Design a protein around this motif. Structure first.
Motif, short mmCIF file in Angstrom:
data_model
loop_
_atom_site.label_atom_id
_atom_site.label_comp_id
_atom_site.label_asym_id
_atom_site.label_seq_id
_atom_site.Cartn_x
_atom_site.Cartn_y
_atom_site.Cartn_z
N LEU A 5 0.84 -1.19 0.00
CA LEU A 5 0.00 0.00 0.00
C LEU A 5 0.88 1.24 0.00
CD1 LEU A 5 -3.26 0.59 1.92
CD2 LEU A 5 -1.51 2.37 1.88
N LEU A 6 0.59 2.17 -0.91
CA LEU A 6 1.37 3.39 -1.04
C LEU A 6 0.44 4.60 -0.99
CD1 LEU A 6 3.12 1.12 -2.70
CD2 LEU A 6 4.38 3.14 -3.47
N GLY A 7 0.97 5.70 -0.46
CA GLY A 7 0.29 6.98 -0.50
C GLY A 7 1.09 7.96 -1.33
N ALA A 8 0.38 8.83 -2.04
CA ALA A 8 1.02 9.81 -2.91
C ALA A 8 0.30 11.14 -2.80
CB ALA A 8 1.03 9.34 -4.37
N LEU A 9 1.05 12.21 -3.06
CA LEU A 9 0.54 13.58 -3.00
C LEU A 9 0.60 14.19 -4.39
CD1 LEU A 9 1.27 16.24 -0.30
CD2 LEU A 9 1.36 16.85 -2.72
N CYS A 10 -0.48 14.85 -4.79
CA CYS A 10 -0.57 15.55 -6.07
C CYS A 10 -0.83 17.02 -5.76
CB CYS A 10 -1.67 14.95 -6.94
SG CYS A 10 -1.67 13.15 -6.99
N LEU A 11 0.22 17.83 -5.81
CA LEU A 11 0.08 19.26 -5.60
C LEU A 11 -0.26 19.95 -6.91
CD1 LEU A 11 2.86 20.88 -6.76
CD2 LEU A 11 3.82 19.58 -4.85
N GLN A 12 -1.16 20.93 -6.85
CA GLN A 12 -1.58 21.68 -8.02
C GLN A 12 -1.35 23.16 -7.76
OE1 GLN A 12 -5.61 20.68 -9.06
NE2 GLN A 12 -5.07 18.62 -9.79
N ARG A 13 -0.42 23.76 -8.49
CA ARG A 13 -0.20 25.19 -8.41
C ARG A 13 -1.23 25.93 -9.26
NH1 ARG A 13 5.20 28.86 -9.75
NH2 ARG A 13 4.11 30.88 -9.60
N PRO A 14 -1.97 26.88 -8.70
CA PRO A 14 -2.86 27.70 -9.53
C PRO A 14 -2.08 28.77 -10.25
CG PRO A 14 -3.01 28.42 -7.28
CD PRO A 14 -2.07 27.24 -7.28
N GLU A 136 2.71 13.91 3.29
CA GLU A 136 3.69 14.92 3.67
C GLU A 136 5.07 14.32 3.88
OE1 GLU A 136 0.84 14.91 5.94
OE2 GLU A 136 1.61 14.22 7.86
N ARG A 137 5.17 13.01 4.15
CA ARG A 137 6.48 12.38 4.23
C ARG A 137 7.15 12.36 2.86
NH1 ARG A 137 8.24 7.25 3.63
NH2 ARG A 137 6.11 6.40 3.44
N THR A 138 6.40 11.98 1.82
CA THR A 138 6.91 12.08 0.46
C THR A 138 7.28 13.52 0.14
OG1 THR A 138 5.42 10.27 -0.12
CG2 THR A 138 6.47 11.46 -1.93
N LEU A 139 6.44 14.46 0.57
CA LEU A 139 6.72 15.87 0.32
C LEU A 139 8.06 16.28 0.92
CD1 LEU A 139 4.31 18.81 0.36
CD2 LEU A 139 6.42 18.98 1.67
N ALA A 140 8.27 15.97 2.19
CA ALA A 140 9.52 16.34 2.85
C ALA A 140 10.71 15.58 2.27
CB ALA A 140 9.42 16.08 4.35
N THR A 141 10.48 14.37 1.76
CA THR A 141 11.58 13.60 1.18
C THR A 141 12.01 14.18 -0.16
OG1 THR A 141 10.73 11.62 2.28
CG2 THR A 141 12.31 11.30 0.49
N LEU A 142 11.06 14.64 -0.96
CA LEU A 142 11.37 15.09 -2.32
C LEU A 142 11.70 16.58 -2.39
CD1 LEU A 142 9.72 13.91 -5.54
CD2 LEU A 142 10.06 16.36 -5.21
N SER A 143 11.09 17.41 -1.55
CA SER A 143 11.21 18.85 -1.71
C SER A 143 12.66 19.30 -1.58
CB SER A 143 10.34 19.56 -0.67
OG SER A 143 8.97 19.24 -0.86
N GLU A 144 13.26 19.10 -0.40
CA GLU A 144 14.64 19.49 -0.15
C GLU A 144 14.86 20.98 -0.40
OE1 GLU A 144 17.10 16.99 -2.52
OE2 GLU A 144 16.60 15.15 -1.42
#
Lengths: 217, 143, 139, 120, 137, 60
Positions: A5-14, A136-144
């Motif tokens: 099972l995986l969770g993912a975040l899809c951010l959308q910039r307006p 948010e874990r994926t977010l913090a891992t990828l953002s840097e």
RNA sequence: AGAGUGUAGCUUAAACAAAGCACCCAACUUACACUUAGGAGAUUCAAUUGACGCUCUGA
């Protein structure tokens, strides 16, 4: 029954600038301005202009123009911001300057042992955590870098499975308040992209379901 | 008549009104903008799409506008602007539905607008009435 | 003196609280007293037949355009809703507690603040002239 | 000399007539029906009909309504109807469309007033 | 005393626990339409209809008569749609409509009416005046 | 998108409201219908916490 | 790759036809709503039977 099972975040910039108006909407805006000036009432500017013209007419037998001249001069002197940057659209695809008119979303370079795929980021979920936690874990891992994606909803946005043994990713959605492109040298080529260019980029059909899910607007 | 099966055929008062999670209290939506017409049009669009979605809407009202004078002191120059504020009250929006609700609102949001969405508080409700000072003077006298 | 003063105070405060609070007038729904002058009035240029026909055609074309816009809006929102609900029912079938956890609300998601788009993007290095602002409002 | 159902003074559609005109303005078309007190229809006109709509531009405009009115007046003179009644609502009567309809029917030769019953 | 209702009482299908979510009669006209619809709908209780209505037999009226021609509905609707296509393609009709100055040939309308669906109207008029009941019983 | 921007002035007895630009402190530009036919307003800045930095910006 | 399906968004509406509802623009209305005046829409093709579109089921 090997599951995952995986969770993912899809951010959308307006977008920060309005859509380029359709010619239909343009001529209707002109017509609306026409009707408005037709059915409008007088202002202090019109009062002073007309009555000063009348004073001049009287004094001939016995200002607003300078102000608007000065204002036009200031307008011509002033420099406006750039809308489109074709240079950035060509060589700076991983940037914002290329497109400010439509919403944006990123894409990461992912690799799997069974199939190398250009897809949206995700992460593995563990029991003592929420799906948004993994998000948010994926977010913090990828953002840097100095950017946060503000969430909007706890509910799930996408469900997508695939077998080899079985993996099931759940997509949440989020809003981007800020964003930069520091650490430009990255393994994962994060690139902000629109829906049509995303479609040109990536093939899959779970991803096609993502296409029909996400709003074009 | 009561004994007969036709009793209660006309009654209507029970038809008409008498006078945890996934249950969201009355929420308020503030819309501040320099253009009264833009604010009103956006509020009208929101109200119409809410009515289409069959989501309940308590009331929509205008907060007191305010005009601000800005002056540049390189030499003395002056100018003035205005700010208008609209407000809507809604309730009963589902949890997952609120996501797409707010998302579509953000997407269709036009330029020159600042929108806030919060819980309706007595502070907001009392910020509409005239700031009567008499009560303040009497309170100070009590103190 | 003490008791009398206290009673007068409390009673006056109660009366003021039970008084029907008035509402601040809105300056948008009040036409300035200086709008009724008959000196402003403008000549009204009679419209031409062709111009009025163009106006009507533009209006009906825009009505068609807007109904198409709301059609595609309906389509988008319906697709999004049905997809979200499919994902939700799948999560409910799989994990019988995480779906309830998702249905749970969260207070930090209610208070939002956002700006609107701009005619142009912000300039990297731009400072405005030196000036100040001052608000002006009445009761 | 016939007896008309006097009564229903509390209810809006008065049955105190012999021939009533009922107009229906739908989202697509326009119907007009001359009927008897018993609820049985006598004659009809409809924008849904081909012989009439072949000519027309829109099935709902004032032109359509006044054409329906003229045709229905012709059909009333066909069926011998020359007196009849029309129960409009306030706004329904204020609408210029069926106002022109009534005017057209009057020029066609039909009065929207029923004679008062005779009996001594 | 009370007795059970014979038939299904009105306004019973609706639900009462949910009332605000329901859609209301926004218009007197909507309410009136629903009213007359339920009025001409039959009822088990005693009503105006079974006192002042004629009580025609439930069996249909017998006719061994001329059937209509077998017109191909597909081609008929096609030709009608082409006619209206050319109509909307015409240029002056929108001005005529939005200026309210148009008319229609009464003779042509009458001829096409009596050709297409006149006989039904004439049958209705005949059975209204009672020619059928008096002639053929 | 932005679609509900262009609209009719839903108000009787409305004076002249001409289009003008508005510049935020950040340099962002916005349309504003305003009384007289100007071309741009600009928002200044007043207050800062650093005394020496305030003095520096006053110098420069 | 196989099963089901199929009138504009809804309707087991279908002769005298493609009907009603829903919907959209404008006006009044703070706004909604009502009302007025205006606006677009379809049964994919060949004979209920087949073949063009849709969902589901597999890799």
């Amino acid at each position: 029954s090997p599951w995952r099972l995986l969770g993912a975040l899809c951010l959308q910039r307006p977008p920060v600038v309005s859509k380029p108006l359709t010619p239909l909407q343009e001529e209707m805006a002109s017509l609306l301005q026409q009707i408005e000036i037709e059915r409008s009432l007088y202002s202090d500017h019109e009062l002073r202009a007309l009555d000063e013209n009348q004073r001049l007419a009287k004094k001939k037998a016995d200002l607003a123009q300078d102000l608007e001249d000065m204002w036009e001069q200031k307008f011509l002197q002033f420099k406006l911001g750039a809308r489109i940057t074709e240079a950035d659209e060509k060589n700076d695809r991983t940037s914002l300057n290329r497109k400010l008119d439509r919403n944006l979303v990123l894409l990461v370079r992912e690799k799997f042992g069974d199939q190398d795929v250009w897809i949206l980021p995700q992460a593995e979920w563990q029991p003592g955590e929420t799906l948004r936690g993994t998000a948010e874990r994926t977010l913090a891992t990828l953002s840097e870098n100095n950017m946060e994606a503000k969430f909007l909803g706890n509910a799930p946005c996408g469900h997508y499975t695939f077998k080899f043994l079985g993996a099931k990713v759940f997509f949440f959605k989020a809003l981007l308040l800020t964003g930069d492109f520091s650490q430009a040298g990255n393994k994962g080529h994060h690139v902000w992209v629109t829906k049509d260019e995303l479609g040109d980029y990536l093939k899959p059909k779970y991803l096609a379901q993502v296409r029909r899910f996400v709003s074009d607007l | 008549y009561k004994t007969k099966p036709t009793h209660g055929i006309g009654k209507y008062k029970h038809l008409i009104k008498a006078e945890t999670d996934y249950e969201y209290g009355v929420l308020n939506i503030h819309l501040t903008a320099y253009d009264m017409t833009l604010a009103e049009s956006y509020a009208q669009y929101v109200h119409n799409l809410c009515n289409s979605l069959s989501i309940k809407v308590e009331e929509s009202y205008a907060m007191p506008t305010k005009t601000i004078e800005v002056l540049q002191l390189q030499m003395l120059l002056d100018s003035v602007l205005t700010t208008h504020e609209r407000v809507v009250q809604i309730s009963g929006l589902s949890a997952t539905f609120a996501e797409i609700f707010l998302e579509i609102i953000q997407s269709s949001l036009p330029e020159g607008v600042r929108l806030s969405v919060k819980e309706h508080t007595e502070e907001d409700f009392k910020g509409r009435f005239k700031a009567r000072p008499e009560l303040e003077e009497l309170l100070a006298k009590l103190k | 003196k003490d008791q009398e003063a206290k009673e007068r105070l409390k009673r006056k405060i109660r009366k003021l609280e039970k008084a029907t609070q008035e509402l601040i007038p809105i300056e948008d729904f009040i036409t300035p007293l200086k709008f009724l002058d008959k000196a402003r009035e403008r000549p009204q240029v009679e419209l031409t037949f062709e111009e009025t026909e163009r106006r009507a055609l533009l209006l009906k074309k825009w009505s068609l355009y807007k109904q198409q816009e709301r059609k595609m809006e309906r389509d988008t929102i319906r697709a999004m809703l049905e997809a979200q609900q499919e994902a939700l029912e799948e999560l409910q079938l799989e994990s019988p507690k995480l779906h309830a956890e998702a249905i749970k609300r969260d207070p930090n998601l209610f208070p939002f603040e956002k700006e609107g788009p701009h005619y142009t993007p912000p300039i990297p290095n731009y400072q405005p002239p030196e000036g100040r602002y001052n608000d002006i409002t009445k009761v | 000399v016939a007896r008309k159902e006097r009564g229903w003074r509390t209810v809006f559609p008065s049955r105190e007539f012999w021939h009533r005109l009922r107009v229906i303005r739908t989202q697509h078309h326009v119907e007009a029906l001359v009927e008897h007190q018993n609820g049985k229809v006598v004659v009809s006109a409809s924008t849904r009909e081909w012989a009439i709509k072949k000519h027309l531009y829109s099935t709902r405009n004032v032109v359509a309504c006044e054409s329906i009115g003229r045709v229905l007046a012709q059909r009333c003179l066909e069926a011998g109807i020359n007196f009849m009644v029309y129960q409009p609502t306030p706004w329904e009567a204020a609408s210029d469309s069926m106002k022109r309809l009534q005017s057209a029917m009057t020029e066609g030769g039909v009065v929207l007033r029923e004679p008062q019953r005779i009996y001594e | 005393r009370r007795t059970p209702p014979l038939g299904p009482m009105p306004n019973s299908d609706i639900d009462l626990s949910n009332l605000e979510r329901l859609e209301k009669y926004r218009s007197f006209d909507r309410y009136r339409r629903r009213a007359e619809q339920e009025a001409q709908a039959p009822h088990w209780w005693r009503t105006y209809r079974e006192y002042f209505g004629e009580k025609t037999d439930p069996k249909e009226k017998i006719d061994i008569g001329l059937p209509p021609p077998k017109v191909s509905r597909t081609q008929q609707l096609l030709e009608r749609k082409q006619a209206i296509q050319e109509l909307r393609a015409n240029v002056e009709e929108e001005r005529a409509a939005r200026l309210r100055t148009a008319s229609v040939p009464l003779d042509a309308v009458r001829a096409e009416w009596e050709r297409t669906c006149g006989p039904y109207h004439k049958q209705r008029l005949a059975e209204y005046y009672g020619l059928y009941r008096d002639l053929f019983h | 998108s932005s679609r509900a921007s262009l609209t009719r002035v839903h108000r009787q007895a409305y004076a002249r409201l001409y289009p003008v630009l508005l510049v935020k402190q950040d340099g962002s530009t916005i349309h504003i219908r305003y009384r007289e036919p100007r071309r741009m307003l600009a928002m200044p800045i007043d207050l800062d916490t650093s005394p020496e930095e305030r003095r520096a910006r006053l110098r420069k």
